[PDB]
Design a protein around this ligand. Structure first.
Ligand SMILES: C[S@@+](CC[C@H](N)C(=O)[O-])C[C@H]1O[C@@H](n2cnc3c(N)ncnc32)[C@H](O)[C@@H]1O
Ligand SMILES: [Mg+2]
Ligand SMILES: [Mg+2]
Ligand SMILES: [Mg+2]
Ligand SMILES: [Mg+2]
Ligand SMILES: [Mg+2]
Ligand SMILES: [Mg+2]
Length: 336
RNA sequence: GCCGGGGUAGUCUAGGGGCUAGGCAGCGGACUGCAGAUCCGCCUUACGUGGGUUCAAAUCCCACCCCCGGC
């Protein structure tokens, strides 16, 4: 209410933290000053209880509207649930989305008319710091582990530069696999690496795991996807790691390399490469293994039925599907 | 070296004199299942360093240190 307290600049702040504290500060208008006076817009209540909640004198001057700019914009989650409640209650739109670089990717069901998907994309382009909005069009389809997309708003380019854990990376969300949600898992690995380790990243994609191991001596980044290597090379030079990370284009099975730290970032077919990974890792070395399952028992069983190994750590990385998870196990391979 | 835009909670991004940020990650639950997923709870005041204007600084000033692009 225009009914705003009028004190002298001097005890401004002190007096303001009291008005807000007692929840009597009308925060929909700006504070103002004219000379040595301070005009705090208060809510309303006889200056008899105001003459008590504080001890300095004042007055109640009722002034016009100085308007207050809207601070924050609402949230994508906040709005889609109010505008599309029906389809949400139908599980036909996700309030979750991820951001790779400066591009966003939403999940909207095929039922949703082509014209509304665009209205949603156009509503996420407006409500989220980005330059483009897409939509998942399929699951991660084998081989190069790529996922079909669909443009919905903004710039129609699939290239961009994601920045995580102190390093930057070139990514093409259209021809190469990349997950901005796996940065936590890379930080995990980042700490385990050693100044003397030699790291073999069996399926390096664009190199997020490789660059993450910048503390090691040498690093081999292998990938069968030709589009992967390109970015990988660029990623290597962009991070000043040329005489450290060696990119190789090939089927990891055909690579004759050797190392003490091996990363197996291929959750679904990882089990079909244990043989190569053990053939790669030096004795005493460790194998970062990823897989999909409801418990660790099955992975532990494979490895054991193949070498004397010790499970250093074993944790749950993320939910993979209804009641299924992506698991991570760090095996110490001593002998075999 | 000089101009610019910056350093934002673990991480990454918006904001830009008095409002306490949005995501991921993390933690706890849920979903009995072709999903690198979704879904519900909880993380309720963080802005490089030193000093300076102001009743009030993450914001404005100056300086310095590092990023990022320019000549
Ligand atoms: C899960 S992606 C790597 C993702 C990356 N670590 C990330 O999170 O950003 C799998 C990669 O393994 C590669 N790949 C698939 N089969 C392979 C094989 N037999 N040998 C080597 N690389 C392979 C694919 O080309 C793909 O780039
Ligand atoms: Mg910024
Ligand atoms: Mg946060
Ligand atoms: Mg959980
Ligand atoms: Mg700043
Ligand atoms: Mg400063
Ligand atoms: Mg303040």
């Amino acid at each position: 209410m225009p009914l705003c307290l009028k004190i002298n600049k001097k005890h401004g702040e002190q007096t303001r933290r009291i008005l807000i504290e007692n929840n009597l500060l009308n925060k929909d208008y700006k504070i103002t000053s004219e000379g040595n006076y301070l005009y705090l817009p208060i809510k309303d209540v006889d200056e008899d209880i105001l003459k008590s909640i504080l001890n300095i004198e004042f007055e109640l001057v009722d002034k016009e509207l100085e308007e207050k700019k809207i601070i924050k914009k609402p949230s994508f989650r906040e709005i889609i649930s109010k505008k599309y409640r029906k389809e949400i209650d139908e599980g036909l739109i996700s309030l979750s989305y991820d951001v790779v670089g400066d591009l966003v990717i939403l999940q909207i069901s095929d039922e949703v008319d082509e014209k509304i998907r665009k209205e949603i994309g156009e509503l996420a382009y407006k409500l989220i710091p980005c330059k483009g909005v897409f939509r998942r069009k399929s699951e991660v389809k084998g081989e190069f582990r790529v996922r079909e997309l669909e443009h919905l708003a903004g710039e129609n380019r699939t290239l961009t530069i994601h920045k995580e854990n102190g390093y930057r990376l070139w990514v093409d969300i259209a021809k190469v696999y990349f997950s901005p949600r796996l940065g936590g898992e890379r930080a995990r690995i980042m700490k385990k690496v050693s100044l003397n380790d030699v790291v073999v990243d069996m399926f390096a994609g664009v190199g997020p795991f490789s660059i993450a191991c910048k503390n090691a001596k040498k690093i081999y980044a292998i990938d069968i996807n030709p589009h992967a290597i390109e970015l990988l090379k660029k990623n290597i030079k962009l991070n000043k790691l040329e005489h450290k990370i060696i990119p190789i284009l090939s089927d990891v099975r055909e690579v004759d390399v050797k190392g003490n730290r091996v990363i197996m970032n291929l959750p679904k077919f990882a089990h079909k490469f244990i043989d190569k990974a053990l053939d790669i890792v030096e004795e005493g070395g460790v194998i970062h293994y990823y897989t999909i399952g409801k418990d660790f028992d099955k992975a532990i069983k494979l490895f054991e039925k193949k070498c004397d190994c010790e499970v250093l750590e074993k944790r749950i990385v993320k939910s993979y599907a209804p009641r299924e998870y992506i698991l991570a196990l760090d095996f110490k391979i001593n002998k075999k």
